Amino acid sequence: GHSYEKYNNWETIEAWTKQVTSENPDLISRTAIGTTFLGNNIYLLKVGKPGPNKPAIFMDCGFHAREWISHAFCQWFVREAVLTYGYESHMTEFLNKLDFYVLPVLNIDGYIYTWTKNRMWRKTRSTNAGTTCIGTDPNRNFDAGWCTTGASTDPCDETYCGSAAESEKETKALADFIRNNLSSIKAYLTIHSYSQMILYPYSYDYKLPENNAELNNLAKAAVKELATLYGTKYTYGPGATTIYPAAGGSDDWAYDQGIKYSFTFELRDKGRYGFILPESQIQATCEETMLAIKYVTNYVLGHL
């Protein structure tokens, strides 16, 4: 069955999205924002106490198939939201004043594949013209300096940027949903591993966002809150100089749509286990990440 303490396969995660919404209709509603290449449903959980014209924070997990602690965290977040609402004053104020759009797994097809065939798969599972090589890197497929740097035009590479921007059903679906909801989404958070980083734009170029100083201080403060629990050390900064130049990412794209608070989160660890983080580390990773997420939420709330 489903556990928050273990990695769950897609069948279990899908059944969980229905069940947790079913058990908490007062705090959660579910939709799909599109389907994947292989016809799976890209679910989105709207977490919050329903009200007219509320602002929102958008968070996705599972961009990259093999980064399983990412998927894990979205599920953890949702449970913590429903558990502490009415019991922990901050989360209670958060759910009352805004919504969280939580997209638990974006790249469902790749995720299934990491379970069925290849644990180290990263990309989507779509076919490509002129080759047998499979998949596009969803985080190289967004219309942000698309395919100009840090991406590959070779479908056989794990940073393949796609035949065109948003060529992928999954990424077009995410981009469509965000455009269509631009006026309410105030922050964009996308969960990855591993590196222990909080990154903001830009990555597709060395330029800096006009609110660079704000973004940097918020990341700084977030990294601090995160450390308070277990002393886990994160680093922070513009993607381009903080890890590497890479075009077509969703964080940069979201920011250029006008969402001023845009962050990629790289969770545990720093390489000892890498993508194959032991399940015994799930709870600790998620707990400390919550503090960073909640700090940002609080900040966004006082800067509407």
Partner: peptide, 5 residues
């Protein structure tokens, strides 16, 4: 998450 950075 690109290998091997």
């Amino acid at each position: 998450x690109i290998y091997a950075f």
